[PDB]
Amino acid sequence: SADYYKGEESNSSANKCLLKVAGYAAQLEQYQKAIDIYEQVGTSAMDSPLLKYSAKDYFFKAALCHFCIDMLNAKLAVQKYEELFPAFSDSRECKLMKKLLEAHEEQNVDSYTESVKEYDSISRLDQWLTTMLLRIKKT
Amino acid sequence: SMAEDADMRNELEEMQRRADQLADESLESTRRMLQLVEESK
């Protein structure tokens, strides 16, 4: 459907189709496809003022997907993501993952659990996000 | 020979009224405002 839409010059739907495809794919433990699609959507929406702010969520999703790869490049990935979008620092997600990484650096599960509980209490989490958080906890 | 009177030592200012629960109540409202403002975005 997305290929047909691109061939029809009908935009604003291919982006959502790719977003949903990546969200589904990340369920089956396939990260490269999800990372590529999420970064493509983020770079497409960065220049659009309407979706520019929402692009932060896509970057956060990509960072979460990239987190499972390895912490060493995950920090670099976060730094790179922060570098290209300095306004990303305004979002609480950056500090959230920074604290999670700080807790994980010494296997301190208590701090990560406290951070996740606080984030859930302040705002509800998605099922996919909760699943990824639990998977990271299993590490 | 009766120990004469003595001057009142002094005054040790100490004031406590009704702050505890009044400011705890004040807080519980701000927290809810924060939650709603977060939800709108």
Written as one string, the DSSP assignment of chain B is -----------------S-HHHHHHHHHHHHHHHHHHHHH-
- Chain A residues closer than 8 Å to B33 by CB: none
Residue A19 is inside which H or E element, if any? helix A14-27
Interface of B with A in 1-41 (CB under 8 A): 34-35, 38-39
The experimental method, as deposited, was: cryo-EM
Interface contacts (A, B; CB < 8 Å):
6
Side-chain-facing half-sphere of A44: CA atoms under 13 Å: 15
CA–CA distance from A61 to each of A121, B7, B14, B32 (Å)? Answer: 20, 75, 55, 27
- Chain B residues closer than 8 Å to A122 by CB: 34-35, 38
